[PDB]
Amino acid sequence: AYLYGTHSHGLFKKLGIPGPTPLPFLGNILSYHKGFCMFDMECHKKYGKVWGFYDGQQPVLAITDPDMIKTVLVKECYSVFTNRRPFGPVGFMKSAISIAEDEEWKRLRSLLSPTFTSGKLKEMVPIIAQYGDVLVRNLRREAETGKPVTLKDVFGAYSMDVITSTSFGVNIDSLNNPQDPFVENTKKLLRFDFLDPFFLSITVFPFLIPILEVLNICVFPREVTNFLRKSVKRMKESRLEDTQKHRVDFLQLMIDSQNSHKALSDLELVAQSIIFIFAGYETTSSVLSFIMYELATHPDVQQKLQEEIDAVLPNKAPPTYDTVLQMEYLDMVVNETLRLFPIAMRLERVCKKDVEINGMFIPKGVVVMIPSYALHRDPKYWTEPEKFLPERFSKKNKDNIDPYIYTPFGSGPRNCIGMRFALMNMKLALIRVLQNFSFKPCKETQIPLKLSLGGLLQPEKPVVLKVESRD
Amino acid sequence: AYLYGTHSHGLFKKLGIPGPTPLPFLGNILSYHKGFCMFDMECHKKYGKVWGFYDGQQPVLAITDPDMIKTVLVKECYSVFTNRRPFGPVGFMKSAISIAEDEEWKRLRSLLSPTFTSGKLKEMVPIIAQYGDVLVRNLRREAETGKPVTLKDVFGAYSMDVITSTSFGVNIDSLNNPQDPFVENTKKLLRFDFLDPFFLSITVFPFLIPILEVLNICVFPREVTNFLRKSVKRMKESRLEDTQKHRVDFLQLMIDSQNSKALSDLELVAQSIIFIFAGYETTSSVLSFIMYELATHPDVQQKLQEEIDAVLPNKAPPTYDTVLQMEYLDMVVNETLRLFPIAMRLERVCKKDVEINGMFIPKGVVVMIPSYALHRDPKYWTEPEKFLPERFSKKNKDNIDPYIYTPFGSGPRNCIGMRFALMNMKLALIRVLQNFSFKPCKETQIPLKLSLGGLLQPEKPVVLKVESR
Amino acid sequence: AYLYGTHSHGLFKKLGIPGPTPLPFLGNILSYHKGFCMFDMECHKKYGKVWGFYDGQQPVLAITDPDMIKTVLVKECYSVFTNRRPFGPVGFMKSAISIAEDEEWKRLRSLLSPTFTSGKLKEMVPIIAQYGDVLVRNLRREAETGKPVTLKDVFGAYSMDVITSTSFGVNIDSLNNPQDPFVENTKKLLRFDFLDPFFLSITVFPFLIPILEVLNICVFPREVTNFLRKSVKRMKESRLDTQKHRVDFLQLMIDSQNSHKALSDLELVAQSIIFIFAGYETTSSVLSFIMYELATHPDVQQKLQEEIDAVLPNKAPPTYDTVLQMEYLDMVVNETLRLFPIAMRLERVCKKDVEINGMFIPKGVVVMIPSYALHRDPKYWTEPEKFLPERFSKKNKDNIDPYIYTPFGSGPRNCIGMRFALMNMKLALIRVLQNFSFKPCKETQIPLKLSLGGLLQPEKPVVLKVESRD
Ligand code: HEM
Ligand code: HEM
Ligand code: HEM
Ligand SMILES: Cc1ncc2n1-c1ccc(Cl)cc1C(c1ccccc1F)=NC2
């Protein structure tokens, strides 16, 4: 992207922007020993408002100023900062919203938009909540042996359960049969760190893109894609001549959208389905494990929230859309877990053409990066950043929060499209389990929690906790 | 090759298997700073019995259990653990047994194992004994004129000498005639770290193969091999066919087994080249190591400096069946091979998804047996950094596990010329100290630091004072 | 190049040559954390007269013996050490003299040589001197405040001005007319570290060249050079109007085309481009370093100031002969270039197995002369860390070995632009020092830290306090 892949390491010196000294070829990849999080944290304090670094040959400029951020994510979204890091030849996956660029993306965003509206989310709630009953079901069985529960298993399965049932309408008990046709293939597909900036080695060695295109050597081969392409083949047609309708999954919502910009294709439809899995599986599972960790080790908050839930759903009353949005304190806790642990942890935009944003020149082909994780813990926005304090998100405390500093779902036209859905999904899980159980740490518990080194935040060791069937 | 060459640095943490945390793209190669062995060492002593690491993008799973190693090298060798690391486009050398994969490997390994019967190694010992007497004759060079002697020079030239006549039927003194186009061309050939996992850039950039293949970039050009190929083509076309000065060497044996589906001529030269790579620096290295151990541990040297004349007194031609006799020497060798397994590692590519013993191994992963770190594993050897030859002699040593001591590996895909290299070295070793003796020079390295590279070797070349007899 | 791009790390241990122990793939790249200079320095002390290391897969043999250096750079230049590192698909820039190899380079060097004579320099001086005036004006404005001056802003501007005027025969004020299309576009071109060994992943990924050649993937695309190329096509056809004819590098190269085979039209543009790479950052950097050295050594500065006044009294304008007269000026330039050779090192690929002065060198290896290290080697220089213009006095003539001291290389493939580069720097030097005095301020970087890259540069731009005179 940047300078046709040529040596770039003198760029931030020309531009007069501080940053770590690069090695030839590698740039600052060695600086990644502490991980993305600690790297960005270190750099922020050391270099200040703004700093450049090099992922191999790819220059990355990090911005912290809220007005600079707004310019990148919002004002100049469509004009200059429309895309993310460039991707390899992934075949038809090219037309997945997350890999789509420029006009293609723009079209695809506009088509996928009405699928994620609040109104149509309300209609999925029945299907999600039923796996909130399935979650507690499988989670009670461990609370009677009184043993350690690995939460990235019980939530992994829940994330999986919701995805399969909302993405394809395929209904499964994941924890109890991992040999189910779908689950094994989904988890196989899920092996690929598709959206990681180190998925291939484009950063170091950028020529990899043009070479692989021209040789049509595909790095996401038909073999991987086939199973779900056939499931969607036999799905579109088969169960959908029922007349009786019913279907409320993502598939149907997209199927329904194909008639009277514009016109979503079959292969396109499929690519959104796949991309939804990548977006939702490990992310949702992780936020859940992160939430329970904070709750289990803060028993005050747990009970306080635990009584707020019983106060609006008396008698473990089944959760409903309207009464989910009812719960302020539940919302304060999700937002705070995500403040500490923004699973993306970094937001990125390639700069399409030379530009001057709030005073600063940015050359074409650069990656403009917003360090979410670092900014979420920036003392110059939050008092006691390292401390988990659901209190910051009380409405007596909403103006103080800057939407361009708190960015767990990004911002602007290219933010998270399934934010509403991610938030609704996780809350229905939380509500159900918290109603029926209290969660407590034991010595088997990684305390304090260590983090994933890589690009996508995750507990370093699986979150393990002891569960009591309760009041 | 693993997960379509794609980012893989999530496996070992997603399988509970510990190991050093990898850098993006590099994986763990920064850890190679210590060398292959010293890495396997600190990893063993840290993560315990099983650990993974990443060679660039290539996920490498190291196993220490004898049962594991047995399932790998022996049980599942035909079905799961058939091949080593994939190779780049190498032309006709795809036929070399070391490069060949699956059943296509098997056909070859079949056509070959006859050639390595002890009933054929036997009739070979004359042609190689020739060089023992060439080695010692050379070696009296600077033993007599009085000066520190660097042993690699005379051991290198020796190992070179055996291979030439045994792989190609050509007797040369490589040290005295160093401009012989043969010695010239095979040393040109031995520049290539061919069997090294880092020969090319596969590990860190696994997309290299399909690219080099399609574009027909040759990594090992016909030029390199032209002189050997079109030499065999003269030793084997016009041949020793019209005449019958019937010689006993690897070349003729293969030639003969073409007149018994079969083996082609280029399939033939393919094997000869391989025997050089397999034979040359390994045979040299072990000798140097053995000589380090004796010179510095003088009591064991004399203990068979004329227990060597108790069998053949004195200065007798070491005929095959007199060399299998010396069981103490036999296991003096074994101890250097313990202390120094040249391979350092054993490696197999898991051809497809399986769970063996209690452990799951997904397709495309390298299962690696760290031969070195076992040979110095205190859990199996009292005083592991010892040089104590007879921890290996008698039915005293039914405790030697053929999975923990495997400096030639095990199962179908172990060292096919084990018996040859062992015979080669032993026979060489007799006709050196039965004429000389060695003292730690005023320049020798103690303790012996090794080479960081993929083929085990002394850091500095070994230097010893050599004496009269 | 080397052994078909195959693994090469075993070589130097084998040849009996010492050096830092490589890593798989990366060779000794991690040692560049120091930068080229400090790496060469520590290797020099640690390893001795000759050492070897690996730029990824690329073996590099470093040599220090003058006899050995004379052999590589001069004697076996045409036979064995004719080229630098290989390049890969760059389009019409293949015929750029710095990129050409073998027979093509010999032809280009021969065709360009008459352009770089001292005579043609003499007639160029009047043109390139009108930019010292612009320099003095530009600088004054920054000094007219009292705020510290980042020299790079004023020397960068100056270096730019001269090159685009000489190489493309135009007259612009890049500091004041930054949106002049020549300025924009020469700045575009200057983004590429064109001649840097790490321009591409070639050192670490040696198959890149053949892969890119067969697949016609261009690294220097042609939108990068379009404006400037098309400029030459509209500029030469306008001068021949056979009446007026400037003496710049463009004219001299058009002159050469008329009445061994003559310079092509695309070859002409190729050169003009390469002269920008060769002249822009180098001149800027050397000018900065000199000023750093004058401002920290006030005694030398003033001594130089009185020479300049005694030959050009009352701020007289420089001329070819009056520049060459200034002995101390020459010593000062030489001494800075000794401490700060911009190239940091000279390289030549070994085309063919040779024994040079008794040491075997295989085909494919880069032989490298560690210029930065040799300029600071105690064996040849007393207190090599000290700035001492006197090393280059007349009295101190042939204590300077011309294979030790190589700010401009040596032999047939040395700097073709040397005489010019020196004239150019001295011209500007004269004018700034006729008008100004330069003192450190709080913001100067003492001690000086050097760039880590392949083209020597101050790490922080040189900031100084600048006073007027009169
Ligand atoms: C589980 C918690 C989740 C978090 C923390 C999360 C966070 C994010 C973030 C930070 C981005 C990047 C936004 C930007 O660059 O400005 C993003 C993008 C995206 N997310 Fe999510 N997400 C989550 C779940 C989901 C789910 C369940 C879906 C739907 C299946 C989804 C669909 C997407 C899509 C499609 C994009 C790309 C938008 C585009 O390029 O047009 N996310 N998400
Ligand atoms: C000190 C001397 C030698 C040692 C320590 C040695 C050791 C080894 C080891 C450890 C292996 C791999 C075992 C495995 O992965 O299962 C091997 C493979 C091999 N060795 Fe040797 N070797 C030596 C000399 C020789 C000689 C002289 C030859 C023949 C001229 C030879 C031919 C081979 C071949 C052909 C293979 C692989 C064949 C196949 O994959 O089927 N080796 N050796
Ligand atoms: C003070 C500034 C300069 C310095 C220190 C400098 C130094 C050098 C050095 C060290 C080399 C390599 C010589 C070798 O390998 O032996 C070189 C080559 C070269 N320089 Fe310069 N140079 C400078 C300015 C210029 C200018 C202004 C031009 C032309 C306008 C120029 C044109 C070249 C060319 C064309 C080559 C390559 C010669 C060939 O391959 O035939 N240089 N220079
Ligand atoms: C889906 C999707 N499409 C585009 C994005 N994403 C995305 C969604 C959620 C999260 Cl937590 C990260 C990303 C990521 C992401 C960042 C680093 C590593 C892996 C990722 F998926 N990038 C933006």
Ligand SMILES: Cc1ncc2n1-c1ccc(Cl)cc1C(c1ccccc1F)=NC2
């Ligand atoms: C022949 C052959 N084919 C496959 C192997 N080998 C092999 C044979 C003998 C030796 Cl002494 C090492 C190796 C090696 C080896 C390992 C690392 C670096 C160089 C090697 F030759 N072995 C695996």
Ligand SMILES: Cc1ncc2n1-c1ccc(Cl)cc1C(c1ccccc1F)=NC2
């Ligand atoms: C123009 C040109 N053509 C060929 C050369 N050069 C050159 C000229 C001047 C300078 Cl100071 C360096 C070089 C360089 C050079 C070396 C390392 C990094 C950048 C360079 F321009 N090398 C030899």
